[PDB]
Design an enzyme around this catalytic site. Structure first.
Site, PDB file in Angstrom:
ATOM      1  N   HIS A 139       8.411  -7.396  13.902  1.00 26.96           N
ATOM      2  CA  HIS A 139       9.371  -6.244  13.920  1.00 26.96           C
ATOM      3  C   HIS A 139      10.939  -6.922  13.329  1.00 26.96           C
ATOM      4  O   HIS A 139      12.005  -6.495  13.982  1.00 26.96           O
ATOM      5  CB  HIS A 139       9.338  -5.936  15.270  1.00 26.96           C
ATOM      6  N   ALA A 152       0.776  -1.186   0.021  1.00 31.04           N
ATOM      7  CA  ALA A 152       0.093   0.089   0.087  1.00 31.04           C
ATOM      8  C   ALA A 152       0.917   1.174   0.037  1.00 31.04           C
ATOM      9  O   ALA A 152       1.861   1.243   0.541  1.00 31.04           O
ATOM     10  CB  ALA A 152      -1.010  -0.119   1.189  1.00 31.04           C
TER      11      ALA A 152
END
Ligand SMILES: Cc1cc2c(cc1C)N(C[C@H](O)[C@H](O)[C@H](O)COP(=O)(O)OP(=O)(O)OC[C@H]1O[C@@H](n3cnc4c(N)ncnc43)[C@H](O)[C@@H]1O)c1[nH]c(=O)[nH]c(=O)c1N2
Ligand SMILES: O=C1O[C@H](CO)[C@@H](O)[C@H](O)[C@H]1O
Length: 566
Positions: free
Chosen positions: A502, A83
């Site tokens: 992460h 995106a």
């Protein structure tokens, strides 16, 4: 036009900052390449209470790991945003930073200019904090004005829904009684404590503040800032010479499958995320020559730690049920090693100290020796000293109302020692990489996660929270009895964890001599004009949620890039 001063590969959390800052000079042209498209109108993204909705949808890359052999053998998804805005469009919106001393370690490692004091102004530069209202203050929201920006592109604040309620009051009191104090602001370099953390939220519009809403849309009519959305970068191509490599541009694939080139006059900045930037380097001939030749690539730069030093955390969840409805603020707690382990701390520390060289030796094999034993020992020593000497937090523990009488906790150890890697599986840019985080590789990693789980069990049983909680439901006492050995806890954690999403370290900022991929200006070794600016460059994990630090890193990088152009 297909020639620009800068090409930024990846219109994500970090890439949009670089594109924003470099296009502030009207004479400098900037092209953003982004595989996805706008999510300005995607309700899974804009909903401030929508975290999780986007999982597995067309805007989730859903990258897949290999079978995790240290963790009971399943594959794990590693989610990432496809995106404009990247992973900031699908993430949990929490805004927390890092321990001052853990950013200071970046300079200790050999990265001149990377310390907490150097990064701090750039966290402020990124941020526009909306101060809490009196009702939000009553709910426990607080900030330290000296460490929050008021003018930056990224809106940060607290939900207009925030209210004081039974659960967050009880948690505050229970942690205080256990010796973990309420701190006003976890973003000032000292994170230990209990806090009502802020989020990346436009509190006015009540919408998620992703990187595109912050750094792209308010600036999109700059005539020197160009976007090629629905466009995938395959690899960089180079000027002639066989000398330090000069990138000439990026080879791209458009939605119709056509392959073409765009050219850069100054630099190519790679911001495709920690699970893609190293692949783009490998496909460009920058990486381990044995891997490149196996996969039909002509090596251009012998830099065999591209894709190595992958570090990620893993997340588990617990839950309880109230006697009645539970409500209030979402809370975070950042406990130190001694908060978690109390009287056992010294023996935990001694066991860990005794295993560091063994961890290092095991990690040497992970890169087939492209990291040296002594260098891994030095890195692991720095991490150990943060944990044990500086007492940085070893866990993040989230508590929040789960609906009705439910209390949910999500938690993760912050600083596991396992390192893994990511490498291309082909020269076909569409082929899935081999992604191996090596979750639970080292004893500390599962032992600390179990200590954290046990601590959450204890907190749920402690006063005054225990007056609200009827029982623990996950794992609960049938699954994990009160007297269960650590092995039983580890087994359950292994059966139920996910990636914490992460990943860092796959184009790590360290001196080349000790295995780094980028220098202290984020320039890829062996190249004149290629940088990586995203999570790939973090040489270690940090204690807080990544975006705050990635925005600050990209803000700092933007100034370094400008200085080098002058
Ligand atoms: C589910 C979940 C939940 C959380 C988080 C992550 C995830 C997955 N995080 C972490 C944080 O959101 C994440 O670390 C950063 O957004 C990553 O930023 P980067 O710039 O490294 O990559 P990022 O992934 O944002 O950007 C890379 C961009 O490159 C594009 N791309 C990739 N390959 C390409 C190619 N070949 N060509 C063109 N474009 C390409 C991608 O589509 C993407 O837009 C988080 N953090 C936080 O601060 N608070 C939180 O609450 C959470 N919670
Ligand atoms: O804010 C969050 O970030 C965590 C990762 O940062 C994620 O694992 C949690 O599910 C989420 O609530």
């Amino acid at each position: 036009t297909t020639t620009y001063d800068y090409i930024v590969v990846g219109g994500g959390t970090s890439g949009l900052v670089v594109a924003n800052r470099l296009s502030e000079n009207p004479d400098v042209s900037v092209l953003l390449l982004e595989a996805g498209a706008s999510v300005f109108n995607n309700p899974d993204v804009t909903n401030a209470n929508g975290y999780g909705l986007a999982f597995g949808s067309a805007i989730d890359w859903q990258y897949q790991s290999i079978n995790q052999s240290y963790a009971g053998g399943k594959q794990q998804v590693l989610r990432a945003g496809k995106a404009l805005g990247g992973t900031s469009t699908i993430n949990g919106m929490a805004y927390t930073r890092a321990e001052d001393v853990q950013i200071d370690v970046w300079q200790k490692l050999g990265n001149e200019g990377w310390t907490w004091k150097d990064l701090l102004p750039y966290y402020l530069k990124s941020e526009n904090l909306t101060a809490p209202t009196s009702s939000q203050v009553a709910a426990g929201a607080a900030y330290n004005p000296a460490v929050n920006g008021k003018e930056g592109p990224l809106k940060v604040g607290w939900s207009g829904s925030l209210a004081s309620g039974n659960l967050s009051v009880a948690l505050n009191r229970t942690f205080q009684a256990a010796g973990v104090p309420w701190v006003e602001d976890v973003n000032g370099g000292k994170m230990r404590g209990f806090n009502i953390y802020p989020s990346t939220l436009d509190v006015d519009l009540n919408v998620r503040e992703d990187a595109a809403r912050a750094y792209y849309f308010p600036y999109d009519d700059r005539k020197n800032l160009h976007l090629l959305e629905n466009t995938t970068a395959n690899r960089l191509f180079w000027k002639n010479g066989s000398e330090e490599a000069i990138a000439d541009g990026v080879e791209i694939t458009s939605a119709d499958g056509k392959v073409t080139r765009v050219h850069a006059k100054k630099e190519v900045i790679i911001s495709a995320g920690a699970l893609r930037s190293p692949l783009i380097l490998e496909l460009s001939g920058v990486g381990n020559p044995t891997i490149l030749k196996k996969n039909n690539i002509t090596p251009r730069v012998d830099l065999p730690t591209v894709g190595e030093n992958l570090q990620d955390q893993f997340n588990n969840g617990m839950a309880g049920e109230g006697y009645g409805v539970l409500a209030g603020a979402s809370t975070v707690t950042y406990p130190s090693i001694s908060d978690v382990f109390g009287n056992e701390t010294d023996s935990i520390v001694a066991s860990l100290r005794s295993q560091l060289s063994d961890y290092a030796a095991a990690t040497v094999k992970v890169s087939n020796g492209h990291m040296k034993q002594e260098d891994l020992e030095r890195l692991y020593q720095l991490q150990f000293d943060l944990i044990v000497k500086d007492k940085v937090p070893i866990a993040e523990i989230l508590f929040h109302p789960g609906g009705g009488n439910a209390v949910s906790s999500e938690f993760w150890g912050l600083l596991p020692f396992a390192r893994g890697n990511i490498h291309i599986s082909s020269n076909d840019p569409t082929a899935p990489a081999a992604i191996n985080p090596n979750y639970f590789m080292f004893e500390w990693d599962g032992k600390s996660q179990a200590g954290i789980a046990k601590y959450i069990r204890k907190i749920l049983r402690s006063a005054p929270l225990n007056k609200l909680i009827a029982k623990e439901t996950k794992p609960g006492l049938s699954e994990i009895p009160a007297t269960a050995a650590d092995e039983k806890w580890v087994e359950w954690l292994k059966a139920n964890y996910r990636s914490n999403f992460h990943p860092v370290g796959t184009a790590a900022m360290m001196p080349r001599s000790i295995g780094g991929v980028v220098d202290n200006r984020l320039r890829v070794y062996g190249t004149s004009n290629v940088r990586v600016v995203d999570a790939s460059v973090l040489p270690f994990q940090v204690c807080g949620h990544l975006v705050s630090t990635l925005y600050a890193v990209a803000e700092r990088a933007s100034d370094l890039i400008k200085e080098d152009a002058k």
